[PDB]
Amino acid sequence: GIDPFTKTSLYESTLKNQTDLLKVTQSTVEDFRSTNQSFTRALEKDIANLPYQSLITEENIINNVGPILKYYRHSINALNVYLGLNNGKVLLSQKSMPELRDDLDIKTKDWYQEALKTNDIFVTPAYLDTVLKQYVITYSKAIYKDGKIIGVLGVDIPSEDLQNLVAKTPGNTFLFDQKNKIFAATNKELLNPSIDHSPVLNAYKLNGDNNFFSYKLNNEERLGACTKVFAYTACITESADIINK
Amino acid sequence: GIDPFTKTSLYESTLKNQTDLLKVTQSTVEDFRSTNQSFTRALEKDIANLPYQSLITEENIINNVGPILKYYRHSINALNVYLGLNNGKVLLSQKSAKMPELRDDLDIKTKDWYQEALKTNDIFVTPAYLDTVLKQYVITYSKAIYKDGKIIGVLGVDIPSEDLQNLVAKTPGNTFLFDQKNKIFAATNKELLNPSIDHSPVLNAYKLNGDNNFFSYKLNNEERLGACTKVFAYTACITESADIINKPIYKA
Ligand SMILES: CC[C@H](C)[C@H](N)C(=O)O
Ligand SMILES: CC[C@H](C)[C@H](N)C(=O)O
What we know:
2 copies of one chain form a homodimer. The first copy, chain A, is an alpha+beta fold. Helices cover 38% and strands 29% of the residues of chain A. In chain A, strands 1, 2, 3, 4, 5, 6 and 7 form a 7-stranded antiparallel beta sheet that branches. The longest helix of chain A is centred in the N-terminal third of the chain and has 45 residues, at 4-48. The radius of gyration of chain A is 22 Å and the shape is elongated. The PDB classes it as signaling protein.
C-alpha cells in the first residue's frame, strides 16, 4: 500500500490487534485451568478436614466422602469426581449414589501415578474416559491428612468445555495440543486432521512466543503469532491483505 | 465535513478491533452471570433432592441442608450461601469452620432477593449492594426452593461484585461497565472508578448513538471515540483518545 509510512502504520496496528486477540485466547486457557485447580483444591481441603475415623474404612469413605464428591460434581457439572485408594478401589461419583469400583485399574493410570509424584495438582492431556467414553481433562491430587495419604482425588472435565470456550473467542485463534495436533479453533473447518500446519509451526519456531510473523499459504501472504500456554500452542493468523491493500 | 481519516482502511480496522475488545468485555459479564446461575440451579436441585421430611423442621434443615450449603460455598469460593425460611430465619454458610447456623435477625422477608424469588420461577439476580453481614458489595443470585410443590424457602448465593471487577480489569482495551443507575461499576483502568471522574460525556453520547455504534465525545478538552452496549442491566463501553485512533504526525 505504497507509502512505507502508511504500510508501517497498518502493520503496527494489525500487530497490536492480533496480539491482543491472541492474549484473549491465552487467558481463556489459563482461566479454564485455574478454575478447575481451585475447585480441586477446595475439594481436597473438605475431604482432608474429615476426621480420620470417617476416612479409614471403605464404608465410611462411601458414606462420608461420597456426598462431598457428588455435591462438588454437581456444582460445576463435572463428568466424574472420584477418590482412588491404595487397595485399587475408587469411590466414583459419575454423571448419569457414588460406588466403590474395583475394576478401573487405577494404579495403571497416569492421573493416579502422577499425583503421587508431585505435591501439586496434576493435569492430564485429554483422553477418552473409561467409564463414560467422553474426552476429558483430569485434575488429580494426592490427599494427605497429618502427612498420611488418604487417596488420590480426580476430577474429569470434558475437553469439549475448553474447546467451546476457545471457539467463541474473537479472532482466527486456535490451539494445538502437546503433540502439535489441532485441539480447538474458532473456525471449525480448521479441525480437519488432514490440514497441514507446518508453515505456521515453522514460523513460530523461528520467531518465538508472541512474535508477529509473515508466512505463505497457496502463494498468498499471511500474518500470525503463536505462544505456549502450558502444554498447548495458541496461535492467531490473518491475511496480509490488511497491509498490502 | 467528513473527517478524511474515517475513509481509511486503518480507521476501519481500528474500529473493528475496538468492537472486538468491547465484545470480550461483554462476554466476561455474560459468562460470570451464566456460571453463577448454573451453580445456583445445581444447588437448588441438590437441596430439593432431600426427602420432604428432611426439609420441614428447623433441626432437619440445619443438619441436612447445612452441609450442602457449605460444600457448594467452598466449591466456588462464594461469600455467603444461605436458605431463607418463611419464619424469617436463615441458614447461613459463610467464612468463620463451624457448621452453618440459623440467624434470626437478618430481616429477610422484606428483602428483594427474597421477595423477587417468590414472584418468579427464575433465578433472580440483584443489583450489587452492601452485604448485611460481611459488609462487602455483592451480587445475589436467588431462587425459591420447592419440594412436592411446597415452598421450603429461598436460596441465596452472594458473589462479591469485586470478582466481576477483577475479571473486567484483566480484559484488553480501555473497557468499563456502568451499573443500572448509570454509575461506574468496573474498569480496566481502575482510575475510572474514582468518583471525581466525569462520565456524563460518554453516557450522553451513548444515548444519542445506540449499541456498538461509535461516537465522538470530549472530556477535559480531549477528543475521544467510544462505543457502548447494553449487557443485561449494565452498560459496557470502550473508549480511546482521538489522537490514538488517528495518531497525529505533529503532536499538539
Ligand atoms: C475413576 C477413573 C476415571 C474413570 C478416569 N477418567 C479414567 O478413565 O481412568
Ligand atoms: C442472609 C442474607 C444475606 C446476608 C444477604 N447478602 C443480605 O444482605 O440480605
